[PDB]
Amino acid sequence: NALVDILPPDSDSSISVMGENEKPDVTYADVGGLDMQKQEIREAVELPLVQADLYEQIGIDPPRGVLLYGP
Amino acid sequence: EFKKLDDKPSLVDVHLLESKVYHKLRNLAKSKASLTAARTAANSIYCPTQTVAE
Amino acid sequence: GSDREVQRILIELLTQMDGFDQSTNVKVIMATNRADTLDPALLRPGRLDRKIEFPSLRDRRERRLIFGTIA
Amino acid sequence: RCKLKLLRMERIKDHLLLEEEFVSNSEILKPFEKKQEEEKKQLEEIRGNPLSIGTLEEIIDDDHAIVTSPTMPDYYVSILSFVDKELLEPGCSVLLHHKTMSIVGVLQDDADPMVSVMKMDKSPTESYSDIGGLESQIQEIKESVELPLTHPELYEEMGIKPPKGVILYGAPGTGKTLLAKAVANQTSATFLRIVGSELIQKYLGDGPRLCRQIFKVAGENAPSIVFIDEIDAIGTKRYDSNSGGEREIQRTMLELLNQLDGFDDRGDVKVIMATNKIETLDPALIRPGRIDRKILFENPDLSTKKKILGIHTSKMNLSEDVNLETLVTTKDDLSGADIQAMCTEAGLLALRERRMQVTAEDFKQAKERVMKNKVEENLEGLYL
Amino acid sequence: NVKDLKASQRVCLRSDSYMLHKVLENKADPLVSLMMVEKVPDSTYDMVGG
Amino acid sequence: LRPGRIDRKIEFPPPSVAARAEILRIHSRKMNLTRGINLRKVAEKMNGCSGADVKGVCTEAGMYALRERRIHVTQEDFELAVGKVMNKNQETAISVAKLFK
Ligand SMILES: Nc1ncnc2c1ncn2[C@@H]1O[C@H](COP(=O)(O)OP(=O)(O)OP(=O)(O)O)[C@@H](O)[C@H]1O
Ligand SMILES: [Mg+2]
């Protein structure tokens, strides 16, 4: 019982990534409606990946988590 | 000006013109941006068949 | 005590949700099927900022889309 | 003013206590005598290192018991037989040895946060004559609650069993809540105080277990006063419908009869109940011989309202402006919490001035606001 | 020693018999449990302004 | 509400238009606007009822400048943002749109 080695922040996973190994079975060519939510999901997800700095150089905070809710 | 006077389904047309002008100036960045605006505005139900075709 | 393990796990979500923030990454996406299971320290902003609603009513062009993509 | 000397006298003795105690410890404590030194040799022989707390499930009478530990293995323990074999009972916490388990010893007291709620953490410094007035309805709580404990002498003379219990009721702001805290300050008997709105939980069956605890502590502590503050808050208060509700309310009421007297035959507990809704209580509790004399409170009359206002104005700064005697006159059979609110608000009007003189003008402005909670929280205003 | 030891102070123990070794610099504060799990910043009067 | 236990009762007014302008101004110093955008002008288009409503004009405006992809928040964003929140303001003043499904 002593700290004798370390383990990287990659290893000792809960489960590996599914976004660069596997790929989901859905795209927005097989989404139909919810066009109203389609404008909202690219604000939250798609724009911070390509450049998170967009929010910062505007001076608006980037949203935190996304709740999806409904029946 | 017609955002102070917004009640208009006639700005849907103005967006589509705006897209065509930008396209022929050969910028697709803001041709896409206006075209996106025009799609959103026609999602609300008042639009002619002609308007949807354009 | 076993129901207190559940609560302890929720507390770690808050800790890691706070720690994650202002980083390039997309702040956690989570979805619910009942919006009566939330708490006022989970739904509170800094954990969940954005609220994308999901209706069942939509409108006639967006219900039209659902008939057509599965068609 | 000029109590400085009394403060210094008191202080001086505190200094003398600090001194004597420190110096005594240091090479005159108990370091150099053989009835400590040789006794502890063989005390530590059978003691650890770990002293491994157990929970006493049951005793067996052969010098053994079955403990279940917090660490989950049982032990059929012995008992060394110097800690007094039968002085330990179920629910006690036991010191087991680091090797083969013997009851090394027994801990009396193990502070639970559940008896913290009942037990006091503050002293109720307002006692007799800061609730002054109702001097005819304090002879039914200091001739049957305070006084038998202070003098069992008077009650040896008549013989029979001493008074048991009281129920206080009347209109809000007659000092009901503080009276109880003021007789328990002076006797210094074991003051448990439990609120009426904590008996009702949104969990079921553990409500009556909480109430059952309160009286076991009372019976364990020979001089005992239990203030149940608010037991009108059992018939107007409910949470969910599956663990609060009617079933919970019935159970708790019945638990309390067994506790208070029932069949238990426990130590002398005085019960003090604040209520003002006296049909939330059993027809087995508002019979007397458990609660003997019953106390009614009415709103204090005008000369009693002079006494109430005199507690409050010893703290108030005074002026040649101030006219106390007209502040009583407007009030007619009103509560002693209106008078207490007027003077606190009169000091709020002083503070706004940013002056430290409280005048007649500050009291009368605050009097009209205090009667406004009775004419405009009433939206009819003048009786329609 | 016991006058340098006090309630709500985390200790280190050495498992030779659980022999109290040193004080632990970090100890728990129960108030931080409340405030952290809630999560609540402080403000000045500029965020009430108006 | 028994008197003796409450000695201060503090109301909060749904804002003035003088107050509603200063709430816009507190949030707009986080933002980077195009110079010459008055926020007194925005507060008069609004009628609001909370300092959250004007917090949402600022928020929505910077999400419109996000879509646009300029650093500066434009005067156009604050026309549209007022009207989005105003529509949402008037749509819980009828009987209340749901916030949880
Ligand atoms: N005779 C009195 N002299 C001094 N202060 C009094 C007197 N009667 C009542 N008060 C004050 O009135 C206030 C309310 O009375 P208290 O809390 O003691 O019990 P109550 O009659 O149950 O009323 P409530 O619970 O509605 O306040 C307290 O601040 C108390 O000090
Ligand atoms: Mg009271």
mmCIF file of N, CA, C and O and ligand atoms in Angstrom, chain D residues 172-173 175-178 181 193 227 229-230 274, chain F residues 2 5, ligand 2:
data_model
loop_
_atom_site.group_PDB
_atom_site.id
_atom_site.type_symbol
_atom_site.label_atom_id
_atom_site.label_comp_id
_atom_site.label_asym_id
_atom_site.label_seq_id
_atom_site.Cartn_x
_atom_site.Cartn_y
_atom_site.Cartn_z
ATOM 1 N N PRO D 172 -52.456 33.260 20.576
ATOM 2 C CA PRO D 172 -51.035 33.524 20.285
ATOM 3 C C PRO D 172 -50.504 34.797 20.928
ATOM 4 O O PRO D 172 -51.185 35.824 20.955
ATOM 5 N N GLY D 173 -49.240 34.757 21.350
ATOM 6 C CA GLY D 173 -48.591 35.901 21.972
ATOM 7 C C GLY D 173 -48.952 36.141 23.425
ATOM 8 O O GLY D 173 -48.948 37.295 23.880
ATOM 9 N N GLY D 175 -47.133 34.343 25.633
ATOM 10 C CA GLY D 175 -45.904 33.990 26.282
ATOM 11 C C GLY D 175 -45.822 32.505 26.496
ATOM 12 O O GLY D 175 -44.988 32.050 27.288
ATOM 13 N N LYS D 176 -46.706 31.743 25.832
ATOM 14 C CA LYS D 176 -46.885 30.327 26.147
ATOM 15 C C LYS D 176 -45.610 29.555 25.908
ATOM 16 O O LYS D 176 -45.274 28.630 26.656
ATOM 17 N N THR D 177 -44.904 29.918 24.843
ATOM 18 C CA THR D 177 -43.753 29.165 24.381
ATOM 19 C C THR D 177 -42.574 29.393 25.296
ATOM 20 O O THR D 177 -41.764 28.491 25.516
ATOM 21 N N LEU D 178 -42.447 30.613 25.793
ATOM 22 C CA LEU D 178 -41.356 30.999 26.669
ATOM 23 C C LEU D 178 -41.582 30.610 28.130
ATOM 24 O O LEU D 178 -40.597 30.412 28.847
ATOM 25 N N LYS D 181 -39.794 27.460 28.993
ATOM 26 C CA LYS D 181 -38.349 27.599 28.937
ATOM 27 C C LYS D 181 -37.829 28.373 30.114
ATOM 28 O O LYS D 181 -36.613 28.487 30.298
ATOM 29 N N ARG D 193 -36.693 19.545 24.682
ATOM 30 C CA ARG D 193 -37.586 20.457 24.005
ATOM 31 C C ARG D 193 -37.693 19.810 22.651
ATOM 32 O O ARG D 193 -36.666 19.533 22.027
ATOM 33 N N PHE D 227 -40.555 19.806 27.240
ATOM 34 C CA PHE D 227 -41.396 20.757 26.540
ATOM 35 C C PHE D 227 -41.657 20.174 25.163
ATOM 36 O O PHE D 227 -40.725 19.950 24.387
ATOM 37 N N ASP D 229 -43.191 21.594 22.325
ATOM 38 C CA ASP D 229 -43.606 22.855 21.753
ATOM 39 C C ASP D 229 -44.479 22.484 20.553
ATOM 40 O O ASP D 229 -44.000 21.800 19.637
ATOM 41 N N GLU D 230 -45.736 22.965 20.533
ATOM 42 C CA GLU D 230 -46.635 22.791 19.385
ATOM 43 C C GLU D 230 -47.168 21.397 19.101
ATOM 44 O O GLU D 230 -46.476 20.583 18.501
ATOM 45 N N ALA D 274 -47.656 23.029 24.397
ATOM 46 C CA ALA D 274 -48.212 24.223 23.798
ATOM 47 C C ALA D 274 -49.111 23.750 22.684
ATOM 48 O O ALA D 274 -48.750 22.842 21.933
ATOM 49 N N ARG F 2 -47.227 35.908 11.337
ATOM 50 C CA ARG F 2 -47.577 36.380 12.670
ATOM 51 C C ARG F 2 -46.653 37.544 13.051
ATOM 52 O O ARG F 2 -45.441 37.446 12.845
ATOM 53 N N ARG F 5 -42.363 38.044 14.701
ATOM 54 C CA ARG F 5 -41.404 37.115 14.127
ATOM 55 C C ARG F 5 -40.927 37.598 12.778
ATOM 56 O O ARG F 5 -40.003 37.016 12.203
HETATM 57 MG MG MG G 2 -44.135 30.512 20.104
#
